[PDB]
Design an enzyme around this catalytic site. Structure first.
Site, short mmCIF file in Angstrom:
data_model
loop_
_atom_site.label_atom_id
_atom_site.label_comp_id
_atom_site.label_asym_id
_atom_site.label_seq_id
_atom_site.Cartn_x
_atom_site.Cartn_y
_atom_site.Cartn_z
N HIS A 62 45.73 -54.09 -11.73
CA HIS A 62 44.57 -54.06 -12.60
C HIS A 62 44.05 -52.64 -12.79
O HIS A 62 43.78 -52.21 -13.91
CB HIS A 62 43.50 -54.99 -12.04
CG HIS A 62 42.14 -54.75 -12.59
ND1 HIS A 62 41.85 -54.88 -13.92
CD2 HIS A 62 40.99 -54.40 -11.98
CE1 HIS A 62 40.57 -54.61 -14.12
NE2 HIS A 62 40.03 -54.32 -12.95
N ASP A 92 49.88 -28.82 -37.65
CA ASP A 92 50.58 -29.63 -36.66
C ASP A 92 49.97 -29.29 -35.31
O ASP A 92 48.92 -28.65 -35.24
CB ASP A 92 52.09 -29.37 -36.69
CG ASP A 92 52.90 -30.62 -36.42
OD1 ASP A 92 52.31 -31.72 -36.40
OD2 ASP A 92 54.12 -30.51 -36.25
N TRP A 127 44.50 -48.94 -5.21
CA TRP A 127 44.96 -47.90 -6.13
C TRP A 127 44.97 -46.51 -5.51
O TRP A 127 45.52 -45.59 -6.12
CB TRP A 127 44.13 -47.92 -7.42
CG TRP A 127 42.81 -47.19 -7.40
CD1 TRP A 127 41.66 -47.63 -6.85
CD2 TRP A 127 42.51 -45.91 -7.98
NE1 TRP A 127 40.66 -46.72 -7.04
CE2 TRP A 127 41.16 -45.65 -7.72
CE3 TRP A 127 43.26 -44.97 -8.68
CZ2 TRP A 127 40.53 -44.48 -8.14
CZ3 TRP A 127 42.64 -43.81 -9.09
CH2 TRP A 127 41.29 -43.58 -8.83
N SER A 157 53.25 -36.89 -18.30
CA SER A 157 52.69 -37.14 -19.62
C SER A 157 51.40 -36.36 -19.82
O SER A 157 51.26 -35.62 -20.81
CB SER A 157 52.45 -38.63 -19.80
OG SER A 157 51.92 -38.92 -21.07
N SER A 158 50.45 -36.50 -18.91
CA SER A 158 49.15 -35.88 -19.10
C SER A 158 49.20 -34.37 -18.96
O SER A 158 48.43 -33.66 -19.63
CB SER A 158 48.13 -36.47 -18.13
OG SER A 158 47.92 -37.84 -18.41
N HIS A 241 38.09 -37.37 -8.12
CA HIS A 241 36.79 -37.16 -8.82
C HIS A 241 37.02 -36.45 -10.16
O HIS A 241 36.52 -36.96 -11.19
CB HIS A 241 35.77 -36.42 -7.94
CG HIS A 241 34.49 -36.31 -8.69
ND1 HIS A 241 33.30 -36.95 -8.38
CD2 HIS A 241 34.27 -35.66 -9.82
CE1 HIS A 241 32.40 -36.65 -9.31
NE2 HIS A 241 32.98 -35.90 -10.23
N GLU A 243 39.23 -36.70 -12.05
CA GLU A 243 39.80 -37.74 -12.95
C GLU A 243 38.66 -38.52 -13.64
O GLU A 243 38.77 -38.75 -14.86
CB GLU A 243 40.72 -38.68 -12.17
CG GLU A 243 41.19 -39.88 -12.98
CD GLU A 243 42.18 -39.55 -14.08
OE1 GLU A 243 42.51 -38.36 -14.24
OE2 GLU A 243 42.62 -40.49 -14.77
N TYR A 245 35.86 -37.65 -14.52
CA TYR A 245 35.23 -36.80 -15.56
C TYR A 245 36.25 -36.59 -16.66
O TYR A 245 35.85 -36.55 -17.76
CB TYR A 245 34.63 -35.56 -14.89
CG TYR A 245 33.52 -35.83 -13.91
CD1 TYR A 245 32.26 -36.15 -14.36
CD2 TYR A 245 33.74 -35.77 -12.55
CE1 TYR A 245 31.23 -36.41 -13.47
CE2 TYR A 245 32.72 -36.02 -11.64
CZ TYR A 245 31.47 -36.36 -12.11
OH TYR A 245 30.43 -36.63 -11.28
N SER A 256 28.54 -37.80 -29.54
CA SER A 256 27.83 -36.77 -30.28
C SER A 256 28.02 -36.91 -31.78
O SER A 256 27.08 -36.72 -32.55
CB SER A 256 28.28 -35.39 -29.81
OG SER A 256 27.48 -34.94 -28.75
N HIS A 290 32.63 -37.11 -0.98
CA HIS A 290 31.50 -38.07 -0.95
C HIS A 290 32.20 -39.42 -0.92
O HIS A 290 31.59 -40.44 -0.89
CB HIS A 290 30.53 -37.77 -2.09
CG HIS A 290 31.06 -37.91 -3.48
ND1 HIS A 290 30.64 -37.11 -4.52
CD2 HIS A 290 31.93 -38.75 -4.00
CE1 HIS A 290 31.27 -37.47 -5.61
NE2 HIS A 290 32.05 -38.45 -5.32
N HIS A 291 33.50 -39.36 -0.89
CA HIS A 291 34.38 -40.53 -0.89
C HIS A 291 34.93 -40.64 0.51
O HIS A 291 35.77 -41.49 0.72
CB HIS A 291 35.57 -40.29 -1.80
CG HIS A 291 35.27 -40.35 -3.26
ND1 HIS A 291 35.14 -41.54 -3.93
CD2 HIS A 291 35.11 -39.39 -4.17
CE1 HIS A 291 34.90 -41.29 -5.19
NE2 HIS A 291 34.88 -40.00 -5.36
N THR A 316 24.05 -33.35 -16.54
CA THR A 316 24.25 -34.63 -17.22
C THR A 316 22.96 -35.13 -17.85
O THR A 316 22.98 -35.72 -18.93
CB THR A 316 24.82 -35.67 -16.26
OG1 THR A 316 25.94 -35.12 -15.57
CG2 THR A 316 25.27 -36.89 -17.01
N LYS A 319 22.28 -33.63 -21.24
CA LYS A 319 22.96 -34.31 -22.34
C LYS A 319 22.29 -35.62 -22.71
O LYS A 319 22.36 -36.04 -23.86
CB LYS A 319 24.42 -34.54 -21.98
CG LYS A 319 25.29 -33.31 -22.13
CD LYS A 319 26.73 -33.68 -22.20
CE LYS A 319 27.47 -32.81 -23.19
NZ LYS A 319 27.40 -33.32 -24.59
N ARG A 438 34.44 -55.23 -0.04
CA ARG A 438 35.33 -55.27 -1.19
C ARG A 438 36.79 -55.41 -0.76
O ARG A 438 37.14 -55.18 0.40
CB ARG A 438 35.13 -54.04 -2.08
CG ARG A 438 35.72 -52.74 -1.58
CD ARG A 438 35.28 -51.58 -2.47
NE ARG A 438 36.37 -51.09 -3.29
CZ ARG A 438 36.42 -49.90 -3.88
NH1 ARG A 438 35.41 -49.06 -3.79
NH2 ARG A 438 37.50 -49.56 -4.56
#
Ligand SMILES: CCCCCCCCCCCCCCCCCC(=O)OC[C@H](COP(=O)([O-])OCC(O)COP(=O)([O-])OC[C@@H](COC(=O)CCCCCCCCCCCCCCCCC)OC(=O)CCCCCCCCCCCCCCCCC)OC(=O)CCCCCCCCCCCCCCCCC
Ligand code: HEA
Ligand code: HEA
Ligand SMILES: CCCCCCCCCCCCCCCC(=O)OC[C@H](COP(=O)(O)OCCN)OC(=O)CCCCCCCCCCCCCCC
Ligand SMILES: CCCCCCCCCCCCCCCC(=O)OC[C@H](COP(=O)(O)OCCN)OC(=O)CCCCCCCCCCCCCCC
Ligand SMILES: CCCCCCCCCCCCCCCC(=O)OC[C@H](COP(=O)(O)OCCN)OC(=O)CCCCCCCCCCCCCCC
Ligand SMILES: CCCCCCCCCCCCCCCC(=O)OC[C@H](COP(=O)(O)OCCN)OC(=O)CCCCCCCCCCCCCCC
Ligand SMILES: CCCCCCCCCCCCCCCC(=O)OC[C@H](COP(=O)(O)OCCN)OC(=O)CCCCCCCCCCCCCCC
Ligand SMILES: CCCCCCCCCCCCCCCC(=O)OC[C@H](COP(=O)(O)OCCN)OC(=O)CCCCCCCCCCCCCCC
Ligand SMILES: CCCCCCCCCCCCCCCC(=O)OC[C@H](COP(=O)(O)OCCN)OC(=O)CCCCCCCCCCCCCCC
Ligand SMILES: CCCCCCCCCCCCCCCC(=O)OC[C@H](COP(=O)(O)OCCN)OC(=O)CCCCCCCCCCCCCCC
Ligand code: CUA
Ligand SMILES: [Ca+2]
Ligand SMILES: [Cu+2]
Ligand SMILES: [Mg+2]
Lengths: 534, 59, 51, 269, 236, 75, 56
Positions: A62, A92, A127, A157-158, A241, A243, A245, A256, A290-291, A316, A319, A438
């Site tokens: 999942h 292009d 995960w 890929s990324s 982390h 990731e 963001y 925006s 913090h994890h 944050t 914004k 969990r």
């Protein structure tokens, strides 16, 4: 036909393949979350016959599908590859053959993850894939290998796509456009491309070292050879982390554009929006532990990470207040994209305020592996990044496709997901504060109450997804008729007060970006003489 | 020797795809395509055993 | 390479002028996506002896 | 050139690449490699013959991709000033990512050594482990590498100046100096008293210096490609981009090895 | 001590550490409610009035006074709650003058307890394993997935040091009502402290995914009086 | 109260306590290797490594010392 | 480097005569075999040298 879609070097055609694969994957990841929520409906074995390994397998599947095969190929692979070259005047991308390999590795990474769940017993690890639970003693056979190779193929890929995004923005802008003149969505793909470039190589070190322990007799993390499991968590979370963001900032740039269009006002303080997006992308490399607040780190280590995590709330919140300042004093037009953007401002704030409580290490003792955490990150990922993905599709697809969608059917779809998402995730905080762990398929009987309520909302939201699948069908079969009858919105901006109906027909579009000035389906040769601005 | 200019005029006046214009390109492309087919099919013919838990008897 | 322009020309699938209805392609494609978690469950519950 | 003639040429400098089969053929070789290695590591395939074939097809399929970039720049004229500047910038972002892969391997080394675990003896190196001494065959290697960053500097500047023989000799020497480094690490490996199986020390040591070993084999392949192209007149005195990317590569690998030699050999022993 | 149906709050506290954790949660939620009151109100009263505004104020694009002010205001709030959050962090980390130490070791789906202070009259190590009672063996009235076949007995009003580790994979020693949560990693020993102020039974669970039996490994702790603990200790 | 256990030690003030066990076991065995097995204040180490250290750990280190494989430097 | 390497060759020649009875005993962390290597006999590494590396 064969060589247009298997040999492609055009950035618009490749972006269409991305979106096709991204939406086929959200089907599977939503089906897994539905099976998960049916087994959690009541105490006892419900549908899986007491197979706890299978329940754990579906939880890994999942998370991997939703993150690496839906949200990244759509927000970045799709919208980034289609709208970034058009918004800066590029003919292009740089490196068009690199742009094509970064798509064709994702189909091969799916026939690696799917065959991982069918071999032996699958990977029931979470995960994050912590060792020693994921080593060959506690997970034998080839399932965890095939899941690591799948993650390797999404990193190729990324990374390759990020190198292409960075060169194109810096080298191929059109006449007169300087880096201070870029649209805010172009800035959001540019900054995201730098976070991927500096965080992906640390994850490839961690999971290749995990592959070496399993098959090559190595002790990076094995305790009998001197290795340390806590090293893996440092290496995994140093990518993790950044990731989250990499998943919200492209949605910051979409929000925006939508908010400014349906207010008829420019974004308030546009220059301080780029400075905030850069500060959040920099502070996202200094907060990763913090994890790991309860694994036994020093008290002075934990006091640093508390204050580092809290200060990302300042950029944050700039914004958030900036977006409320552009809609104040506006002329608001409540089309479907505008509904999602207003819900984003309310549901993202809630998810971010439960993160401020989690940021203190003293309070995280009562908030570890607690459903309370699951409630935090489904408010910012499923009422956050997902809501910005719907806002984007309704905003740009009529232009991209040349076909309009049924408007009043789309407002029913919005209300069904807004109601149903809140029903799943709001009671998750009640379960966590009372102490429910969990990653369990079964629980004590006192947790039955809120677990039944959340399983009902899971059916409401899946019905809203099936309505979206029909709206796609209606747009593709009846899109040309949706323009002549009164079943869809033609203009996202209406005439001004003193502007007459016929004067409005001289300039129908009042846009501050190029993309709304092209032909409806944009031409395959979009620019010959370069565009020019002052 | 120098053959840049001569190959420059062969390439620029050819209708064939880019990877086919050199006169020597048949000797690479024919055997590669056959080898590429074996290297893709054969791993796929083993997933049925992997799901069924049958291991090769190299013993 | 030169391609065509228009409405139904920038997508890899055919929607009009086809013999079979487009509904069989549209909903068949999204049905197979929704159906892969259930194939996995079937194989694994048939390995545990539950079936 | 009037308006009629200017119409027959592009209005922008950027490169429009024609459709090619290589990007989707490389992806299939990557999946054939992933499926074969996992299946042989666990006994479902008897031997290593299928892994060998998948590595051979990943290799000859990248060659053909590189073969089509030579023709687009030497025989077609598609690499204008703007295309050249973009290629250089893409390569610098590639090496920055590869540098941070070593940065993750240096984290794992320092994590294991500053507060060593008690099953080792609470000492670094662990008890019973005989390590490689710095003032040895590894000191011949750090000189052989520093000596190739100055013979590659005078070859590059002899090509800008138009001297052909001097250019062709300062590259044939850089080739055999990287080749010498590669076989010197081979000797140092088959003689070491410990193995990658010997706990956490043999894991972080052979990972940091073993990755660097693999890049050098890639570096010696690049100098052989430049050698064929410079000897057969592809490179000109003002247009040689396949050469500058190689030069930047030999200098970053020089700095990385310098760090390995100070941490893995002088401080950690 | 035990979870209750439809509960939306902390379980009742038995230690000063869980008293302080709850005090910091409530202090933070005071300020998160001011912020949510503002944002939800501005959002509501902007849609309701400017969805009916025919002339947009397109020449308002910046403000120096408000932009400086709304950059400083979140910093003051963030600083207000960091003061008690730092004090609680160092008050819970200290383990000074304990009177007894207990070891807890996690296994593939059971726990294990060891007493090695040698206070009992014969001076041995007291040790036993703790298992969840299976569903087929439950007696009517016992609690599913909570009650165990043996429990850990501690005295009241005594400072206790807990030492936690593991044998195979990572587990987690956690009891919500005592303010305890700490990973149990193969290879290292972590410690925590407690001081229980009333008698009763306190329930917990494993909190680090450990495989198929992650849900079947509960923790049960009984706190009794001092003369009652010495009698239990001197027998088992 | 009749309850006593080892207290705060300034060498090991953090949550991590792994080296506290291992050093007391190491000090104890080298105290009896030169000052004899019996020593009034050589029991100070014996109490500490027993109080806060798993029984399976001591079981492994004892077997290693028998084969001369203990990694600690006690002789 | 030739001088220092020439000395180590005789030290290799002396070890090649040492029988396996007085080879020093492995520690707990040495010669880890979580599962055999999938090539050859399952007990040797890539650059394994019988003179200097042994598993007993
Ligand atoms: C071996 C490498 C392959 C190259 C040679 C193979 C084929 C030979 C062709 C013979 C025909 C002929 O007459 O050719 C004359 C031909 C005349 O060409 P021309 O007149 O100048 O113009 C022709 C056109 O330019 C274009 O010329 P063309 O169209 O005739 O072909 C040129 C070349 C393609 O040109 C290229 O672009 C070649 C570029 C290849 C790059 C090599 C790098 C990879 C190899 C390294 C191996 C390990 C790396 C791993 C990295 C480490 C990470 C783990 O052709 C190919 O190689 C095509 C692919 C082969 C077929 C694939 C399918 C197999 C079935 C057959 O000249 C050549 O032979 C040029 C070949 C290129 C030489 C590259 C030198 C290699 C670098 C040194 C290696 C040392 C590294 C060792 C490390 C040390 C550790 C101890
Ligand atoms: C992208 C992130 C994402 C998304 C969208 C979701 C969506 C959902 N998630 Fe999940 N979830 C995670 C990420 C996500 N989740 C992660 C990382 C974990 C933790 C894994 C771990 O514990 O190891 C997790 C764990 C997790 C659990 C914990 C299980 C346990 O601990 O074992 C549960 C339990 O119910 C759950 C439920 C749901 C539900 C009900 C939804 C549904 O509500 C979804 C609601 C909305 C939709 C139906 C999606 C929209 C549909 C699309 C296809 C979009 C198409 C849009 C366009 C193309 C324009 N999630
Ligand atoms: C989109 C993804 C996303 C985003 C944006 C975030 C954003 C934040 N997250 Fe989250 N997080 C996750 C995804 C995300 N997270 C996931 C997936 C996990 C679980 C991983 C796993 O275990 O699998 C997780 C878990 C996680 C943890 C680990 C907890 C644990 O595991 O025990 C922490 C710790 O502090 C954290 C905190 C924060 C904070 C402070 C922000 C901040 O950025 C929020 C800041 C935003 C605001 C604050 C709102 C608006 C602000 C204002 C209006 C200013 C005024 C406010 C004040 C003055 C207070 N979250
Ligand atoms: C599992 C083992 C690991 C294998 C690694 C994955 C292998 C996938 C790629 C296979 C190599 C085929 C050659 C494609 C590359 C190419 O050709 O680069 C050449 C491209 C061609 O540009 P163009 O044709 O697009 O434009 C047309 C213009 N003529 O020049 C550039 O972009 C310039 C920048 C160079 C950057 C190249 C980066 C190297 C790619 C590998 C990156 C892998 C990162 C992850 C590391 C583990
Ligand atoms: C942009 C790049 C960002 C770089 C990140 C550096 C910021 C560090 C701030 C926190 C440091 C700290 O304070 O860490 C304190 C902790 C102390 O740990 P302890 O409690 O166990 O001490 C108990 C003592 N017995 O050391 C750590 O955890 C190690 C973390 C070091 C970070 C290494 C980063 C290396 C980057 C490589 C990737 C390159 C890409
Ligand atoms: C203490 C924390 C406060 C947090 C507030 C966050 C609230 C978020 C909601 C924001 C919506 C309102 C938008 C701002 C209005 C605006 O546009 O202000 C900008 C306009 C434009 O002035 P000008 O460019 O024409 O002239 C040049 C001016 N230098 O000047 C004003 O109107 C003044 C507003 C009053 C100042 C705020 C006082 C607060 C007490
Ligand atoms: C459930 C079906 C219930 C029937 C409702 C009939 C609607 C009445 C009507 O006919 O409504 C007419 C509207 C046209 O809208 P209108 O504005 O033109 O008419 C209004 C005049 N003022 O068509 C619809 O709503 C179609 C509704 C379709 C609902 C969902 C269809 C199935 C989706 C799930 C299947 C796809 C997922 C499969 C892949 C896994
Ligand atoms: C099964 C039918 C076979 C019929 C037998 C042939 C007899 C003649 C009948 C004529 C039909 C010919 C069949 C050819 C196949 C075909 O046209 O539709 C068949 C195609 C499949 O093929 P595919 O090319 O898409 O590849 C994919 C194969 N895996 O389904 C589909 O993708 C349906 C997909 C629709 C969903 C996508 C919705 C996205 C909309 C675009 C929005 C983009 C937004 C972008 C923003 C960034
Ligand atoms: C995707 C991005 C990649 C991230 C990579 C992070 C981690 C990489 C570090 C390991 C790289 C390979 C180490 C060199 C081999 C070595 O270890 O040297 C060889 C060692 C030393 O010989 P010996 O032990 O016999 O002792 C000598 C006593 N006489 O023998 C072995 O190991 C045998 C086992 C073979 C190891 C091969 C492992 C291949 C998997 C990784 C592939 C490379 C990664 C991708 C690189 C492009
Ligand atoms: C097992 C399989 C592994 C396969 C990997 C093989 C790697 C070996 C290296 C071979 C490189 C050959 C490149 C020559 C092409 C050329 O011709 O470049 C020359 C061209 C032409 O410009 P010109 O100046 O000559 O103009 C002539 C006068 N007008 O310029 C460029 O394109 C510059 C870009 C070159 C970058 C090449 C890619 C480097 C990164 C690839 C990394 C892939 C592996 C990564 C693994 C982590
Ligand atoms: C987005 C995430 C939000 C975070 C919220 C997490 C929870 C925080 C703690 C809230 C305490 C609730 C009071 C308990 C009342 C009770 O006593 O409950 C009583 C009953 C059952 O109680 P009972 O019969 O079991 O026993 C006790 C019998 N008296 O339940 C209920 O009436 C459920 C009603 C729900 C309460 C509404 C919650 C409103 C809080 C809004 C928070 C806003 C977030 C701020 C910004 C992040
Ligand atoms: Cu032990 Cu979960
Ligand atoms: Ca259940
Ligand atoms: Cu985080
Ligand atoms: Mg955890």
């Amino acid at each position: 036909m064969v060589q247009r879609w298997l040999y492609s070097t055009n950035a618009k055609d490749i972006a269409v393949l991305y979106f096709m694969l991204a939406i086929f994957s959200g089907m599977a990841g939503t089906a897994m979350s539905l099976i998960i929520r049916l087994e959690l409906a009541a105490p006892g074995s419900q549908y899986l016959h007491g197979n706890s390994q299978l329940f754990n397998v579906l939880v890994v599947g999942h998370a991997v599908l939703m993150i690496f095969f839906l949200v990244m190929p759509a927000l970045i692979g799709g919208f980034g590859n289609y709208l970034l070259p058009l918004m800066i005047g590029a003919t292009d991308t740089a490196f068009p053959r690199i742009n094509n390999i970064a798509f064709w590795v994702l189909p091969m990474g799916l026939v690696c993850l799917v065959t991982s769940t069918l071999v032996e017993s699958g990977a029931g690890t979470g995960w994050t894939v912590y060792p020693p639970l994921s080593s060959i003693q506690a997970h034998s056979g080839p399932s965890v290998d095939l899941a690591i190779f799948a993650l390797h193929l999404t990193s190729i890929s990324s990374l390759l796509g990020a190198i292409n995004f960075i060169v194109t923005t810096l080298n191929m802008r059109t006449n007169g456009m300087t880096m201070h003149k870029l649209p805010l969505f172009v800035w959001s793909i540019f900054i995201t491309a730098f976070l991927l470039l500096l965080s992906l190589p640390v994850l490839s070190a961690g999971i290749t070292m995990l592959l070496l322990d399993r098959n090559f007799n190595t002790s990076f993390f094995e305790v009998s050879g001197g290795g340390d499991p806590i090293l893996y968590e440092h290496l995994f979370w140093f990518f993790g982390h950044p990731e989250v963001y990499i998943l919200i900032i492209p949605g910051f740039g979409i929000i925006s554009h939508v908010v400014s269009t349906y207010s008829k006002k420019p974004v308030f303080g546009e220059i301080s929006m780029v400075y905030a997006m850069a500060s959040i992308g920099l502070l996202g490399f200094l907060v990763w532990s913090h994890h790991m607040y309860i694994v036994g780190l020093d008290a002075d280590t934990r006091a640093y990470f508390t204050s580092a995590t809290m200060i990302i709330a300042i950029p944050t919140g700039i914004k958030i207040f900036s977006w409320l300042a552009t809609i104040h004093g506006g002329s608001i037009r409540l089309a479907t994209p505008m509904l999602y953007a207003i819900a984003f401002l309310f549901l993202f704030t809630m998810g971010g305020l439960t993160g401020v409580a989690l940021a203190n290490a003293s309070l995280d003792v009562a908030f570890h592996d607690t459903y309370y955490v699951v409630g935090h990150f489904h408010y910012v990922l499923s009422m956050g990044a997902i809501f910005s993905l719907f806002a984007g599709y309704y905003y740009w697809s009529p232009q991209i496709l040349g076909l309009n969608y049924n408007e009043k059917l789309a407002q029913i779809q919005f209300w069904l997901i807004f109601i149903g998402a809140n029903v799943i995730f709001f009671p998750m905080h009640f379960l966590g504060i009372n102490g429910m762990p969990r990653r369990i398929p079964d629980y004590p009987d006192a947790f039955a109450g809120w677990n039944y309520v959340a399983s009902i909302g899971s059916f409401i939201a899946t019905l809203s997804l099936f309505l979206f699948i029909y709206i796609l069908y209606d747009q593709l079969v009846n899109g040309l008729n949706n323009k002549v009858n009164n079943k869809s919105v033609i203009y996202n901006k209406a005439p001004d007060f003193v502007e007459s109906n016929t004067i409005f027909n001289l300039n129908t579009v009042k846009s501050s970006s190029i993309e709304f000035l092209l032909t409806s389906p944009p031409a395959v040769h979009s620019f010959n003489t370069p565009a020019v601005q002052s | 020797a120098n053959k840049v200019i001569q190959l420059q005029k062969i390439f620029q006046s050819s209708t064939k795809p880019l990877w086919w214009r050199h006169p020597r390109s048949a000797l690479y492309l024919y055997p590669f395509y056959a080898i590429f087919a074996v290297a893709v099919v054969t791993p796929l013919l083993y997933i049925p055993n992997a799901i069924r838990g049958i291991k090769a008897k190299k013993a | 390479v030169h391609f065509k322009d228009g409405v139904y020309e920038n997508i890899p699938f055919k929607v009009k002028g086809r013999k079979t209805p487009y509904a069989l392609s549209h909903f068949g494609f999204f049905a197979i996506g929704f159906a892969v978690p259930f194939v996995a469950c079937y194989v694994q519950l048939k390995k545990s002896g539950a079936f | 050139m009037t308006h009629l003639e200017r119409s027959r040429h592009q209005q922008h400098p950027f490169h429009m690449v024609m459709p090619s089969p290589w990007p989707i053929v490389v992806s299939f070789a990557l999946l054939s490699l992933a499926l074969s290695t996992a299946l042989t590591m666990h006994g479902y395939i008897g031997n290593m013959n299928m892994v060998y074939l998948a590595l051979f097809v990943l290799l000859t399929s990248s060659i053909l991709w590189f073969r089509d970039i030579v023709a687009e720049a030497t025989y077609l004229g598609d690499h204008t000033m703007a295309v050249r500047k973009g290629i250089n910038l893409g390569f610098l972002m590639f090496v920055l990512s590869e540098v941070l892969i070593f940065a993750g391997l240096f984290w794992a080394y320092f994590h294991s050594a500053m507060s060593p675990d008690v099953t080792l003896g609470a000492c670094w190196p662990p008890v019973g482990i005989e390590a490689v001494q710095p003032t040895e065959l590894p000191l011949l290697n750090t000189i052989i590498l520093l000596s190739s960053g100055a013979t590659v500097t005078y070859s590059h500047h002899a090509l800008i100046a138009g001297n052909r023989n001097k250019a062709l000799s300062g590259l044939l020497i850089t080739f055999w100096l990287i080749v010498i480094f590669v076989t010197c690490q081979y000797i140092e490996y088959t003689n070491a008293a410990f193995t990658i199986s010997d706990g956490v020390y043999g894991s972080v040591f052979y990972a940091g210096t073993g990755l660097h070993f693999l890049h050098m084999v890639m570096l010696a392949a690049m100098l052989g490609v430049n050698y064929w192209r410079m000897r057969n007149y592809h490179l000109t005195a003002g247009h040689h981009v396949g050469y500058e990317t190689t030069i930047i590569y030999t200098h970053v690998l020089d700095v990385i090895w310098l760090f390995l030699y100070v941490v893995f050999y002088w401080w950690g022993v | 001590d035990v979870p209750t149906p439809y509960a939306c709050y902390f379980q009742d506290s038995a230690t000063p550490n869980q008293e302080g954790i709850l005090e910091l949660h409530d202090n933070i939620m005071f300020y998160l409610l001011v912020i949510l009151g503002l944002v939800s109100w501005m959002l509501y009263t902007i849609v309701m009035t400017y969805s009916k505004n025919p002339i947009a104020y397109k020449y308002i694009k910046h403000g120096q006074t408000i932009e400086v002010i709304w950059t400083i205001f979140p910093a003051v709030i963030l600083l207000i709650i960091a003061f008690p959050s730092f004090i609680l962090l160092y008050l819970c980390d200290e383990v000074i003058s304990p009177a007894m130490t207990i070891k807890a070791i996690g296994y593939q789906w059971y726990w294990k307890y060891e007493y090695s202070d040698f206070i009992n009259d014969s001076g041995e190590t007291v040790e036993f394993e703790s298992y969840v009672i299976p569903d087929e063996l439950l007696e009517e009235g016992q609690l599913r997935l909570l009650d165990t076949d043996t429990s850990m007995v501690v005295p009241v009003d005594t400072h206790i040091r807990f030492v936690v580790t593991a044998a195979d994979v990572i587990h987690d020693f956690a009891i919500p009502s005592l303010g305890i949560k700490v990973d149990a990693t193969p290879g290292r020993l972590n410690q925590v402290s407690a001081l229980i102020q009333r008698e009763g039974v306190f329930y917990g669970a494993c909190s680090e995914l450990c495989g198929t039996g992650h849900a079947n490994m509960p923790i049960k702790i009984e706190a009794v009086s001092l003369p009652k603990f010495l009698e239990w200790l001197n027998e088992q | 109260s009749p309850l006593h256990t080892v207290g705060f030690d300034a060498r090991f003030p953090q949550q991590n306590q792994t080296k506290h066990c291992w050093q007391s076991y190491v000090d104890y065995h080298k105290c009896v290797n030169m000052k004899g097995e019996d020593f009034a204040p050589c029991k100070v180490f014996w109490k500490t490594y027993n109080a806060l250290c798993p029984l399976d750990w001591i079981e492994k280190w004892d077997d290693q010392r028998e084969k001369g494989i203990f990694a600690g430097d006690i002789n | 480097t030739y001088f220092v390497e020439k000395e180590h060759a005789e030290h290799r020649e002396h070890l090649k005569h040492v029988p396996d009875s007085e080879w020093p005993r492995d520690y707990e962390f040495m010669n880890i075999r979580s599962k055999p290597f999938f090539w050859g006999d399952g007990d040797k590494t890539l650059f394994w040298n019988p003179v200097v590396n042994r598993h007993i």
